[PDB]
Structures are given as structure tokens and as C-alpha cells.
């Protein structure tokens, strides 16, 4: 089947329908809130590693808060929820890329663009690794350029439809 | 510091998977041969590739272990998933065990086309479970190690080479029983 | 994988490409026909319980009509067709919501909006339960408002595109 | 009577899933302890939580029953799915059966942390199969009953507490073998 | 030559799936009774519906074959998948085997409602594996043949009735263990 | 889960982001290159048999090129990659259509429209079979007309958005 977990409402009001990663969920120990536009892609895309990690973290928090946590772990719970939470085939694709010598995602690190003035960002994409090290930025700068193009085209189309409606 | 389209600044984040520790096991790699899977903050399994065996018999008394019911259920679940994920396992002598007192000790004898061997399947499963970074045809793996040993352990900061992550265990969950052989007509 | 069952053509000509629930399929023993627009969402969406029940009922009818039915059941048939008909993870999500004390869908009851004048409707959504009873309408009236907004926006955009095409 | 946006009347429908009886099993709940799964309009299985046991031996002669081939195949399939869906079952003495003459009688002994017990796994499977409506840590379940009994029965209007529904069985289909333990090296 | 909307020419293509031979098995049909699954360009399995049996004992010595480890691993995998895909198999004498010298010979005895029989399940699996193009209730299949025989063979141009295709094997991969009965309480 | 295999870049420059079937992959032993528009649908659709065959062929080629091929086969490789490459439920759907007497796809033959002047085409769809023979064209001409209608509507909408942007 397909994943189904709905993300819980973001604590931060800056992103009304987005999602926030607290200081504990990040290595840089800071808070990063992503807006509704980026988080909405997570409901329909099937190949976004970041949206699978978001679903994992959200499931973890909700389980810790609504169920009585004990030190002994209920392996059963994650065993039953896994396919409702993540696409295991995404994992298989990263494994296949790894064994063929193609750069692959190890779910650790993600990059995104930030439109400084406005604060909108893009949906983070996995920073690929190869030969035991992270790819240099110049090796995938084309994808970054593409993401910028997408953020432009989609914003322009929204403004067009707005102008039309008014 | 890197600016795209003159208005888009490139920024990064890295997730701390360690915080998932209470709801799913976390695997990591110390070096090429040593890997760990932690369950909670108190226990886990250490998987070591080694030339030094610790079991010198042919027994694996799983049913007696089940009846005595002294072991940790999560660890036994992990062991079962690992073994059921091995492709084409057909040499029962290659696997020996010790469960006395509720402990978990499992030893795979890897000594000997090298592809259609227990060593290849065991090593592929081992590489998949931690996924922490000789060469064979297709997806074939070979090492110089004579044994793979899986023993229970207490929590310790083992993740020097790779960060803890749940991805390997979750991925292997779907591999279970996928490549097992029939051993009798009535399963 | 993903569900694949195509709904059979609706008997009622009022909804050319929609679907009709006959008197037997409903507790109120009446006929309810939904139009092509609402039913088209069932081909692309993955989290609509109602579209899974539609696929189940359609499979049942087609199996009874094209195969020689007997009282002894071919459990094997549904066993092989199940994942082609429904998303089992939707079921798992409702189970997880149930065990966490969150209101959940038990697939019995569905609500939808009806634009009286025209007769057009929205795709029915499951009526959630909590504490052994159906949720009171006031508890999810916000979702009803959201559905109404969606029905307005999509219609307006279609008229815009129409004006554009002409 | 309930108008939204001025022009949208809120209307409802309820599906009669009872009409699916010929192509898929339908489960329902009579009360907290008693549940039913009917297969077609002629036969089915009643599952009862009870202090009153009906089997007082340790046998479950499944292979001989297969040999004789007198039981209803759909009911045996449902039994197999149920048992394969139990997580971490490791006490074979807790399950007894009688199949003489093609009958189906299965009895789970629930008598005794309470989470890593046969009672919890059996009760979770029972809760999932009917899903018709004490509390333990995580997803753990406990009851005061000593036995769960599953016996074949003829059709009757048993659905006093919840409507018949195929959802429980269909959902349980994916649970099969997901959490079984290994009992030997060559499956 | 067929023009639609005055500007759209209808054109066709047919895929040569034979080129997939090195990475996946390819099944094809010679006629109603005879089908083949080749693995690469050198070896494969011929499955024949026939009235002439070749095995006249009740043995299927799977464990000894595994211990000796002389067979082709891919063919053993395919045999295991086929057998694990049969629904409701419960008559172990109906299956006989010969594995001496690494050879593969498997014989299903289809002789005898007709739906709840080994013949029907075996024939449905056979229909699914090749899918190369009397009628019972629901999905039930019956033929007049007394045996289904599966033996290894070398590559040859066998595909007179249907083109080689990987679809049947791949589709059957998901059917594994889906409809197996329990034969003991502790799998 | 859902398929994840990304198609490798097309050799032919005529279709920058499309895919090309060489003489070996086709019975008529010629080269057919499909453009980016048609091949892009393969990333989001779940019921296109042709896109599953494309993923199979691309996996085959990449495996033959990046892994050391030997005559002994690595059945395990395809066994693990299968669900990352194809929707097995599509296969189940075609099996179910076959046993119920509905015309079904046997993955051999596909039809598509060609806009002669420009050379742009539509995504090939399976030519169904029934009773051991291919359907006559007149039996599914309505679908061909529908495909033509779609190729018009979508092109006009793109032209509209273009006009809007300039
Ligand atoms: C994904 O791939 C990346 C790139 O390969 C990989 O990043 C590597 O992670 C390891 C483990 O965190 C890093 O190794 C660390 O490096 C420094 C310098 O040696 C030290 O801080 C670390 O050792 C200390 O900390 C450990 C953890 O607490 C302790 O166990 C240890 O005793 C020390 O106190 C450690 O060696 C390595 O530098 C990076 N590599 C790069 C290029 O950044 C990442 O782990 C992969 N992620 C997953 C989930 O697989
Ligand atoms: C989803 O959840 C809802 C809400 O919890 C749940 O609705 C309940 O269904 C039961 C079973 O249908 C209803 O109980 C009925 O109530 C009345 C009054 O007692 C009677 O009509 C019924 O008894 C007669 O009919 C039965 C059915 O034929 C006979 O077996 C019986 O002998 C009697 O003739 C029956 O008790 C209950 O009222 C509702 N609750 C609400 C709030 O509406 C629904 O069943 C759940 N669905 C699923 C599929 O789980
Ligand atoms: C999908 O369904 C279609 C339609 O049912 C089906 O097409 C059929 O394929 C077979 C096998 O290719 C064709 O049979 C061929 O017909 C001619 C005339 O007899 C001969 O060329 C062929 O025999 C020679 O070639 C074979 C292949 O090399 C050799 O094995 C043989 O010794 C001969 O040299 C062969 O008999 C049949 O004509 C078509 N039918 C139609 C209507 O086109 C197709 O195979 C199905 N595909 C799948 C994957 O199931
Ligand atoms: C791990 O597996 C290896 C490989 O099987 C084991 O080594 C093998 O040990 C056996 C005896 O258990 C040796 O067989 C004997 O060898 C000689 C003749 O070669 C003779 O004593 C007997 O007739 C018998 O055949 C076998 O040769 C040897 N294989 C090697 C060294 O490659 C090893 O014991 C296993 N280790 C553990 C800890 O179980
Ligand atoms: C189990 O489900 C089956 C299939 O839906 C139900 O059988 C169906 O029952 C209905 C209502 O009685 C029948 O419809 C009626 O049929 C005739 C004309 O065919 C006539 O009396 C009425 O006009 C009405 O249409 C329907 O034919 C029948 N289907 C079959 C295949 O027999 C059955 O009622 C359900 N059982 C239970 C216990 O709910
Ligand atoms: C369901 O399981 C319970 C728990 O195992 C069974 O009760 C147990 O019965 C056994 C005998 O079969 C008792 O063991 C005996 O007890 C006394 C000493 O306590 C003595 O006679 C023997 O030395 C032996 O140990 C056991 O105590 C008892 N456990 C209880 C009551 O908690 C029960 O019989 C099972 N039900 C069925 C129907 O089989
Ligand atoms: C089984 O499948 C393999 C792999 O697809 C087929 O081998 C392939 O055969 C083609 C056509 O003969 C080879 O292409 C030719 O290769 C050389 C240059 O490399 C030259 O003769 C031609 O210009 C043409 O490109 C292809 O290289 C070869 N692939 C491999 C990996 O060896 C084989 O034909 C199939 N066998 C059967 C019985 O269908
Ligand atoms: C495939 O299975 C069939 C059906 O079971 C086998 O035929 C059966 O053969 C047995 C003996 O192995 C026959 O039983 C004996 O029959 C007579 C009385 O009918 C008598 O000699 C004994 O008391 C015993 O009951 C059985 O009748 C017969 N069934 C038939 C012919 O329908 C067949 O041998 C199997 N094929 C192979 C190759 O093993
Ligand atoms: C661990 O030991 C192996 C050798 O095992 C020996 O040979 C086996 C075939 C069997 O007979 C065992 O009982 C023997 O003890 C070491 O393999 C050597 O590795 C080096 C480096 O790769 C290589 O050059 C040698 O040819 C290998 N020798 C053989 C005989 O294969 C292996 O290195 C040891 N591992 C470690 C970490 O020290
Ligand atoms: C069914 O019986 C149980 C208790 O069974 C007894 O105690 C077991 C521990 C074991 O020794 C069995 O063989 C015995 O027959 C009843 O449980 C009681 O429930 C009440 C109400 O919840 C509670 O206050 C008591 O403490 C429980 N007693 C024990 C000993 O646990 C249960 O109520 C009985 N059920 C019915 C429907 O009568
Ligand atoms: O292969 C099987 O599933 C059954 O094999 C039957 O025949 C045995 C041979 O296969 C071989 O393994 O050894 C000699 C034969 O016994 C078994 O008899 C059968 O075991 C059941 O038989 C009845 C009872 O004694 C056993 O406990 C059952 O498991 C296998 O299922
Ligand atoms: O664990 C296994 O798969 C094999 O165990 C082998 O050793 C047995 C022990 O594990 C224990 O269960 O009981 C004592 C030992 O026999 C079995 O010998 C082996 O059984 C097969 O071996 C070949 C043949 O003799 C048997 O009939 C087979 O069942 C287990 O596969
Ligand atoms: O069904 C089971 O899993 C256990 O059955 C126990 O009882 C047997 C009967 O079920 C029947 O198969 O044959 C007669 C009885 O022996 C078995 O005793 C038990 O076997 C294990 O018990 C511990 C050890 O002695 C055995 O080697 C194990 O196989 C089955 O697990
Ligand atoms: C984007 O930039 C703004 C302005 O510097 C900053 O406040 C915000 O945190 C950034 N967004 C993220 C997700 O880091
Ligand atoms: C890996 O680390 C362990 C633990 O210290 C050590 O025993 C072993 O030698 C290391 N392996 C290598 C290859 O350095
Ligand atoms: C693990 O965490 C628990 C709280 O969840 C704490 O009480 C316990 O001391 C911790 N154990 C260790 C070994 O740090
Ligand atoms: C919506 O309202 C119209 C007008 O009253 C009615 O005819 C129609 O049946 C309603 N639609 C549904 C699906 O009930
Ligand atoms: C449930 O109903 C059964 C059947 O009438 C009855 O025996 C039993 O007492 C009831 N159980 C409860 C818990 O009320
Ligand atoms: C079940 O339905 C069948 C028709 O399919 C009918 O022959 C039979 O009498 C019914 N059985 C009962 C017990 O009502
Ligand atoms: C259970 O099945 C057997 C075997 O068909 C039958 O004789 C018996 O009557 C059934 N029991 C009930 C209570 O219906
Ligand atoms: C099918 O072909 C085989 C192999 O040539 C032949 O022995 C057999 O007679 C054929 N079967 C039928 C039913 O024509
Ligand atoms: C479409 O037609 C053009 C012009 O004849 C031709 O070159 C091209 O190959 C055709 N496309 C396909 C995919 O066959």
C-alpha cells in the first residue's frame, strides 16, 4: 500500500500548516520551521526521503506522548506502523544505488534554499554521499538551480491565478 | 555563503536520529567489522566479523529457549528477522547458538563459485542491516573473516564511523522470508 | 503496490462517469448517485476510505455477475484481490488512531455536502467515532467548512479556465 | 436542517456491508467478550473470552487433520491467518485444539511484566480481527479471562453491538507471519 | 493508414522481452499442456501436464538435497516459490520429488467439490506462472490430466504459442506463503 | 510501497528528457524515442503498464553495465528490486480481468498516436487481448479518440499558461 500518517499541527504559528523541527531533532541544535507549501508536498509525493523522516519523527513524538512509555521497547508497535509511516522501496532504491556505485542518500543530511527576504524555503532534499564522503556542492549544483527555477515558476503561476480570480 | 539566482541562499540541516531511540532500534557502525543495534538506552546486539569463534558445537536449541522464555523478546525478534532475511540459507551446520540463562549468542561459520555460499548471503544481510558504508559478480560479497558473531550487549557510545539510524532494520523488515527454501512439503 | 480496480460504468445516466449506490448497499434503502468529478478523485487519491468501499462493492458485484456464485466461498479470490482493491495501510492508520485515543473511521458512516439547486455533491468523508459514539457535528464543522471552500475554489478555477479557452 | 455556506446542505449515508457476505468474511461484535466471523450465509466462527475451558489436553493434531481433509477450507484458512498474526507466540502448550470429524475447536490458555506474554499477543489479535469497540504500556492489553475459545457455528443474527464488516479480516491479512519467531535453522 | 482527428496517425510497437534474459526468468507457453521457464540462456524448467508419471514413490528428500548442495540455486528458488504459492496445499503424498545428483524432478499427482482439491490449487498456480492464454465455480480450474511434472532442461526455442515474458514469475513472487496452512503451533 | 526507479537519461538528443527504445528492445528492430512530456507521466502514474516495462528495461541495462555480468544468474537481485521497479497489483488486475473474461493486457503490444508534422507522440497504452487474439481497433476506438482529446486539451492549456506568462 501507501503511507497514510498525517503530520500533527505545527507548534510554531509562523508556519500555520507547516512543521517544525525542534532543537532535539537537529544536530545544529536549533529550531527550523517549514511552511505549509513545502509540507503539503509530503502528502502526495512518494520519493521524498525528508517527508518519510518527518513522518517517523512525528510518530515517535505522538507515541511518546499518548502512550505510557517504558524503557522496554514495544518493537511490535513500529513493526506494525512502519509501512503506514515510510516507503520501504525508497530505502530499496538507495540500497540499489549504493551497490551500483551511484551516489545515494543515507538519510543523515539535507539541503534547501531560503528566499532570505520573504523566508519561504523549499522542501529539503537529501545530500547524497559517494565513496564514504558527502558530494561536493558543485557536483549537484544543477539540481539546486532546478529547484530555484521550480520555486520561481510555481510562485509565478500562483500569482497569475490570483490576478485571474480577483 | 553560496547564493543561487541572486536571492536564494543554500542552507543545510542534519537530523538527530538518536532521538528515535524509544520507539525503534538504531543501528550503527564502529568500523568495517564491528556494528551495533541498540534497543532503547539499555541493551542491544553487537555483530562482529572475526577469526575467533566462541562456540565449538553444532547445536542451536531454539525451541528449548522459547519454552524457558528467559530471553529479551525484542532481541529475539531482531535475531529472527536477521535470520529470516538471509537469501538461500541451506546449511544448518553453519549456524550455532547459545541461549543458556536468557543470553543471546549466535555464530555463523563463514569458511568454505563463491556467490552460491552461506557466506555471501550472511554478508549481504550484515551489510544491509547496518548499511554504514573482495568484489564479486552481480551483488556478491566476500571477506577474509571466518565467523560472524552476534551477542547481546549493554549500551555504550559505539558509533564512531557512522551515525545511529533506523533505516537498515526497517528496510530488512520487508525482506523477511522472501528468499527462504522449502524444507518439507507441508510448511 | 497501489490499488488498481477501475470502477464499472454507472447505471444511472444522470451521472455519466460517476457511480451509483443502489438501495441494497445503503441502510436508508435508497439510491445515491455521485457525479464524475467526485468519483474521479478516487482514481488518484490514496487516503479516501469511501473510495476503498466503492472498489469493494464494485468488485463484489462484478464477481457475482461474471463468476458462477456458489454458497461455499472462494476465500482465495478476495485474498488475491484485496491489495488491488484497497489500501491496507489506511486500515492500519485507523487502528493506530483508535489505540491512541484519537477519533477514527470505522467505515460505517459518511457525510457529504449537497448543493441543493444543482444536485452536485462532494466526495463523502468518513464520520469519525470517539468513546463508542459518533462525533457530534460541531466537533468537525471546521472540516465541513474546508470542504465547502474547496468546492467553491475548484469550481471557480474551472470557470476561469473555461473563460480562458473560449 | 444544517446549512453550510448558505447553499450547501449536509447529508449523510451509511453503507450496508452485510451485502458483501458472499465474497468476503464479515466479522462483528455481540458484546465485550463475544465476537463472530461469518463466511457466507451458512457457517462461521464464534470467538469467546471465557473462564470455562472446553479442552483439557495438550494436543493440537493439525497434520492428522490435514491428512483426513474433512474440515471447511475457508474456516481453516481463517484459523491459520489468526494464529499466524499473533506476535511473538512462543508457548505451544498454551494452544490446544480438537478437529475430529471436521469440527474446529481451538482454545488459547491466557492464564499467567504482563506485555511479553501469550495473553497480550492473543488479545491484540482478537482486538484487531473484530475491531468492534486492563490498560497496559504502549499497545499492551490485559483481561481477567482465562481462555479464548474459537468454535465453528451456523449463521445467526449475532451483531448486537457492532455492524458486520470485512475490515478486520482484510487488515489482518497483511499481519500474517510478520512477527513469528524462528524455531529451527532451516524453515 | 488509420488517421484520427485528421492529424493523428495510430502507430504500434511490440517489446522484445527476450533481451531481459540475464537479469530475470522468462516464461513461455508451447501449447495448453507444456510450458517453460528459462533462467538465462543455458538452463531452465519444463512444466508438463501429462498422464505418464515418472516417479513411483512417496519421497521428497528436500533436506538431504539442501545438505548436499549440488542443485542450481536459482532453480531451487523457483521451485520453492511455485510450491509456496499453492493455496491450501494439505496432502503431502500428492507431491513427490527426486533430487539425486543435483537434478530437479517434481511430480504433483492431480488425481481425485472439485474446488477444494490439490489439483485445483496446483492448476491455478500453473496457470498464473506462465499466463500464456473444465470451468469451475468462482476461479476454479479442472483438467483431465493425472500429473504435473517439473524437470530441468537446457535452452531451446520452445515458445511457439506465447512470447517469453517475466510477468508471471514476478506476479507470483507476491503470492508466496499467502495461503499456506499452519501445521504446528510454533512455526 | 510504491515504485521508485528513476529512468536513466535518453541517449537521443531529440528527446532531451525522454526515453529511447533501441532496435533490440523492439520486435520491429528500429529506434523509437519518446519525449519528456510522455516520459514524465511515468514518474507519477500508478496504472501505466508501459512505464513499468520501461523501468524493467532500464534496470536490466543498468545492471548489465554497472555489475559484472556472468551466465549464472543473480535471481536475488531482481527478487529484491521487483517492487522498486513495478506495481505487482497492475499484474494482479490484469490476471483478474483475464479470469473474469474482460479483455486484458499481456504486456506485449502497445499503441500510441503520432502528430506526424511535429513528431510528438502520446504515452503508449497496452493493446488488449481476448480469446487469444488482439482486439480489433474498432473495439477500442473510443479510447483512441479520448487520448486525442486529452492531447488537445493539455496542449491548449499549456498555450494558455504561456500567453499568461508573457
Ligand atoms: C552518512 O554519511 C556521512 C558521510 O560519510 C557520515 O558522516 C560521518 O559520521 C561519522 C559518525 O558521526 C563521523 O565521524 C565522527 O568524526 C569526528 C572526528 O573523528 C568525531 O566527532 C566522532 O568521534 C566522536 O564521536 C563519536 C560519536 O559520539 C564517538 O563514538 C567517538 O568516541 C568520538 O567521541 C566521529 O568519529 C564522520 O566525521 C562523518 N563524516 C563526514 C564526512 O562528515 C554519516 O554518519 C552517515 N550517516 C548515517 C546515518 O549512516
Ligand atoms: C461504527 O460505530 C458506530 C458507533 O459506535 C456503531 O453504531 C452502532 O451499531 C450498533 C449495531 O448496529 C447499534 O446497536 C443497535 O441499536 C439498536 C438499539 O439497541 C437496535 O436497533 C439494534 O438491535 C437490533 O438490531 C440488531 C441488528 O440486526 C439485532 O442483532 C438485534 O437483535 C436487534 O434486533 C442494535 O443493538 C448501535 O445503536 C449503533 N450506535 C450508534 C451510536 O448509532 C457501528 O456499528 C460501528 N460500525 C462498525 C462496522 O463497526
Ligand atoms: C500476447 O498475446 C498475443 C495474442 O494472443 C500473442 O501473440 C502470439 O504470439 C505467438 C508466439 O510468438 C505467435 O505464434 C507465432 O506465429 C507464427 C505463425 O505460426 C510463427 O512465426 C511462430 O512460430 C515460429 O517462431 C517461434 C518464435 O521464434 C518459434 O518458436 C517457432 O518454432 C517458429 O519458428 C509462432 O507460432 C502468434 O502468432 C501470436 N498471435 C498473434 C495474434 O499475433 C503474444 O505472444 C502474447 N504475449 C505474451 C507475452 O504472452
Ligand atoms: C567452521 O567450518 C569449517 C569448515 O567446515 C570447519 O573446519 C573443518 O573442520 C572439519 C572437522 O569438523 C574438518 O573435517 C575433517 O578434516 C580432516 C581431513 O581434512 C579429518 O580430520 C576428517 O576426516 C574431517 O574431514 C574440515 O577439514 C575443516 N575444514 C577446513 C579446515 O576448511 C571448522 O571446524 C568450523 N568451525 C567451528 C568453530 O565450528
Ligand atoms: C448476501 O449478499 C447477497 C449478494 O448481495 C445477497 O443476495 C441478494 O439479495 C438481494 C435481496 O434479497 C437480491 O435482490 C433481489 O433479487 C430479486 C431479483 O433478482 C428480487 O427479489 C428483488 O428485486 C431484488 O433485486 C439479490 O438478487 C441477491 N443476490 C444473489 C446473488 O442472490 C444476500 O441477501 C446477502 N445475505 C445476507 C444474509 O445479508
Ligand atoms: C492453563 O494454564 C494454567 C497455568 O499454567 C494451568 O494451571 C496450572 O496447572 C498446572 C498443572 O497442569 C499446575 O502445576 C502443578 O501445580 C502444583 C503446584 O503448584 C502441583 O500439582 C504440581 O507440582 C504442578 O506444578 C499449575 O500450578 C497451575 N497454574 C496455576 C493454577 O496458575 C491450567 O491448568 C491450564 N488450563 C488448562 C485447561 O489446561
Ligand atoms: C540474452 O540477452 C542478452 C543481453 O541482452 C543478449 O546479448 C546481447 O545481444 C545483442 C545482440 O546480439 C548484443 O548487441 C551486439 O553487441 C555487439 C557490440 O557490443 C555487436 O555484435 C552488435 O553491434 C550489437 O550491439 C549485446 O551486446 C548482447 N549483450 C551482452 C551483455 O552480451 C542475448 O542475445 C540474449 N540471448 C537470447 C538467446 O535471446
Ligand atoms: C496418484 O493418486 C492416486 C489416487 O490416490 C493413486 O491411485 C490410488 O492408488 C492406491 C494405491 O497406491 C489405491 O488404493 C488401493 O486400491 C485398492 C482398492 O481400491 C486396493 O489395492 C487397496 O486396498 C488400496 O485401497 C487407490 O484405489 C488408487 N486410487 C484411484 C485409482 O483412484 C495413484 O497411484 C497415484 N499415482 C502415483 C504415481 O503414485
Ligand atoms: C583470518 O584468517 C584468514 C585465513 O584463514 C585461514 O585460511 C582459511 C582458508 C581456513 O583454512 C582457516 O582455517 C585459516 O585460518 C586470513 O586470510 C588472509 O587474508 C590476507 C589479507 O586479505 C590474504 O592475503 C591471505 O591470502 C588470506 N589467507 C587465506 C588462507 O585466505 C584473514 O586475513 C584473517 N583475518 C584477519 C582480520 O586477520
Ligand atoms: C474469571 O476468573 C478470574 C480469575 O481467575 C482466577 O484467578 C486466576 C489468577 C487463576 O488462578 C484462575 O485459575 C482463577 O480461576 C476473575 O478475575 C477477577 O476479576 C475481578 C474483577 O475484575 C478482580 O477484582 C479480581 O481480582 C480478579 N481475580 C483474580 C484472581 O485475578 C474474573 O473476574 C472472572 N471472570 C468472570 C467473567 O467471572
Ligand atoms: O513433507 C512433509 O511435510 C511430510 O512428510 C511426511 O513424510 C515423511 C517424509 O517426508 C520424510 O521427511 O520422512 C519420512 C516421512 O515421515 C511426514 O510424515 C509428515 O509429518 C507428519 O506426519 C505425521 C506425524 O507423525 C508428524 O508429526 C507430522 O508432521 C510431513 O508433514
Ligand atoms: O535446525 C535445523 O534446521 C536442523 O537441525 C539439525 O540438528 C538437530 C538439532 O537442531 C535439534 O533440533 O535436534 C537434534 C538434531 O537432529 C537436524 O538434524 C536437521 O534435521 C534435518 O536433517 C536431515 C535429516 O536427518 C532430518 O530429517 C532433517 O529434518 C535440521 O534441519
Ligand atoms: O506443536 C508444537 O509446536 C509442539 O508440539 C509438541 O507436542 C507434539 C505434538 O504437537 C505432535 O506434533 O506430536 C507429539 C508431540 O511431541 C512438541 O513436543 C514440540 O516439540 C518441541 O518441544 C521441545 C523439544 O523436545 C522438541 O524437539 C521440539 O520440537 C512442538 O514444538
Ligand atoms: C530562512 O531565513 C530566515 C531569515 O534569515 C531565517 O530566519 C529562517 O530561519 C530561515 N529558514 C530556515 C528553515 O532555516
Ligand atoms: C573495530 O573495532 C573493534 C572494537 O575496538 C576492534 O576490536 C577491531 O579491531 C576493529 N576493527 C578494525 C578492522 O579496525
Ligand atoms: C534510560 O532512560 C530511563 C528513562 O526512560 C532512565 O530511567 C534510565 O536510567 C536510563 N538508563 C540508562 C542506562 O541510562
Ligand atoms: C442532493 O440533493 C438533490 C436535490 O434535493 C437530491 O435529488 C439528490 O439525491 C441529493 N444527492 C444525494 C447524493 O443524495
Ligand atoms: C456476552 O453475550 C454472551 C451471549 O449471550 C453472554 O453469555 C455473556 O455473558 C456476555 N458477556 C458480557 C461480558 O456481558
Ligand atoms: C443461503 O443462500 C442461498 C442462496 O445463495 C440459499 O440457497 C440458502 O438457503 C441460504 N441459507 C440460509 C441458511 O438461509
Ligand atoms: C462444526 O462443524 C462440524 C463439521 O462440519 C459440524 O458437524 C458441526 O455441526 C459444526 N458445529 C456447529 C456448532 O455448527
Ligand atoms: C504439446 O506439445 C508437446 C511437445 O511437443 C507434445 O508432446 C504434446 O502432444 C502437445 N500437447 C497437446 C495437447 O497438443
Ligand atoms: C512519429 O512520426 C515521425 C514522422 O514520421 C517519425 O519520425 C517518428 O519516428 C514517429 N515516432 C515514433 C515514436 O514512432
mmCIF file of N, CA and C and ligand atoms in Angstrom, chain E residues 9 11-13, chain F residues 14 30-35 112-122 124, ligand 22:
data_model
loop_
_atom_site.group_PDB
_atom_site.id
_atom_site.type_symbol
_atom_site.label_atom_id
_atom_site.label_comp_id
_atom_site.label_asym_id
_atom_site.label_seq_id
_atom_site.Cartn_x
_atom_site.Cartn_y
_atom_site.Cartn_z
ATOM 1 N N UNK E 9 -1.762 9.930 -36.430
ATOM 2 C CA UNK E 9 -1.592 8.603 -37.006
ATOM 3 C C UNK E 9 -1.427 7.582 -35.884
ATOM 4 N N UNK E 11 0.041 4.391 -34.400
ATOM 5 C CA UNK E 11 1.197 3.530 -34.599
ATOM 6 C C UNK E 11 1.345 2.602 -33.400
ATOM 7 N N UNK E 12 2.071 1.504 -33.606
ATOM 8 C CA UNK E 12 2.189 0.442 -32.616
ATOM 9 C C UNK E 12 3.648 0.045 -32.436
ATOM 10 N N UNK E 13 3.930 -0.576 -31.292
ATOM 11 C CA UNK E 13 5.211 -1.216 -31.033
ATOM 12 C C UNK E 13 4.986 -2.477 -30.212
ATOM 13 N N UNK F 14 17.224 14.258 -29.506
ATOM 14 C CA UNK F 14 15.931 14.743 -29.982
ATOM 15 C C UNK F 14 14.923 14.840 -28.842
ATOM 16 N N UNK F 30 13.745 -1.310 -34.720
ATOM 17 C CA UNK F 30 14.024 0.086 -35.042
ATOM 18 C C UNK F 30 14.136 0.865 -33.738
ATOM 19 N N UNK F 31 14.456 2.148 -33.865
ATOM 20 C CA UNK F 31 14.621 3.026 -32.715
ATOM 21 C C UNK F 31 13.432 3.966 -32.592
ATOM 22 N N UNK F 32 12.831 3.987 -31.410
ATOM 23 C CA UNK F 32 11.722 4.880 -31.107
ATOM 24 C C UNK F 32 11.991 5.662 -29.834
ATOM 25 N N UNK F 33 12.070 6.979 -29.972
ATOM 26 C CA UNK F 33 12.354 7.883 -28.872
ATOM 27 C C UNK F 33 11.089 8.650 -28.526
ATOM 28 N N UNK F 34 10.725 8.621 -27.250
ATOM 29 C CA UNK F 34 9.573 9.338 -26.734
ATOM 30 C C UNK F 34 10.028 10.528 -25.900
ATOM 31 N N UNK F 35 9.309 11.637 -26.057
ATOM 32 C CA UNK F 35 9.703 12.904 -25.480
ATOM 33 C C UNK F 35 9.513 12.990 -23.979
ATOM 34 N N UNK F 112 -0.016 4.001 -29.797
ATOM 35 C CA UNK F 112 0.104 5.411 -29.454
ATOM 36 C C UNK F 112 -0.203 6.245 -30.686
ATOM 37 N N UNK F 113 -0.519 7.515 -30.456
ATOM 38 C CA UNK F 113 -0.761 8.450 -31.543
ATOM 39 C C UNK F 113 0.513 9.223 -31.859
ATOM 40 N N UNK F 114 0.661 9.589 -33.128
ATOM 41 C CA UNK F 114 1.800 10.363 -33.603
ATOM 42 C C UNK F 114 1.291 11.579 -34.358
ATOM 43 N N UNK F 115 1.672 12.768 -33.897
ATOM 44 C CA UNK F 115 1.367 14.007 -34.609
ATOM 45 C C UNK F 115 2.411 14.151 -35.705
ATOM 46 N N UNK F 116 2.089 13.593 -36.875
ATOM 47 C CA UNK F 116 3.013 13.458 -37.998
ATOM 48 C C UNK F 116 3.927 14.665 -38.208
ATOM 49 N N UNK F 117 3.330 15.846 -38.399
ATOM 50 C CA UNK F 117 4.093 17.052 -38.718
ATOM 51 C C UNK F 117 5.220 17.313 -37.721
ATOM 52 N N UNK F 118 4.912 17.289 -36.425
ATOM 53 C CA UNK F 118 5.894 17.635 -35.404
ATOM 54 C C UNK F 118 6.707 16.441 -34.919
ATOM 55 N N UNK F 119 6.131 15.243 -34.941
ATOM 56 C CA UNK F 119 6.750 14.051 -34.401
ATOM 57 C C UNK F 119 6.496 13.777 -32.936
ATOM 58 N N UNK F 120 5.782 14.655 -32.238
ATOM 59 C CA UNK F 120 5.420 14.400 -30.852
ATOM 60 C C UNK F 120 4.373 13.296 -30.776
ATOM 61 N N UNK F 121 4.435 12.507 -29.707
ATOM 62 C CA UNK F 121 3.555 11.361 -29.545
ATOM 63 C C UNK F 121 2.945 11.365 -28.152
ATOM 64 N N UNK F 122 2.019 10.438 -27.936
ATOM 65 C CA UNK F 122 1.433 10.188 -26.629
ATOM 66 C C UNK F 122 2.088 8.976 -25.979
ATOM 67 N N UNK F 124 2.431 5.389 -24.898
ATOM 68 C CA UNK F 124 1.813 4.152 -25.397
ATOM 69 C C UNK F 124 0.953 3.465 -24.344
HETATM 70 C C1 LIG G 22 6.349 9.831 -35.437
HETATM 71 O O1 LIG G 22 6.411 10.257 -36.779
HETATM 72 C C2 LIG G 22 7.644 10.808 -37.183
HETATM 73 C C3 LIG G 22 7.474 11.406 -38.561
HETATM 74 O O2 LIG G 22 7.186 10.386 -39.487
HETATM 75 C C4 LIG G 22 8.698 9.707 -37.119
HETATM 76 O O3 LIG G 22 9.971 10.183 -37.486
HETATM 77 C C5 LIG G 22 8.789 9.226 -35.680
HETATM 78 O O4 LIG G 22 9.677 8.150 -35.543
HETATM 79 C C6 LIG G 22 7.426 8.769 -35.166
HETATM 80 N N1 LIG G 22 7.543 8.478 -33.763
HETATM 81 C C7 LIG G 22 7.503 7.245 -33.235
HETATM 82 C C8 LIG G 22 7.654 7.179 -31.736
HETATM 83 O O5 LIG G 22 7.354 6.239 -33.908
#
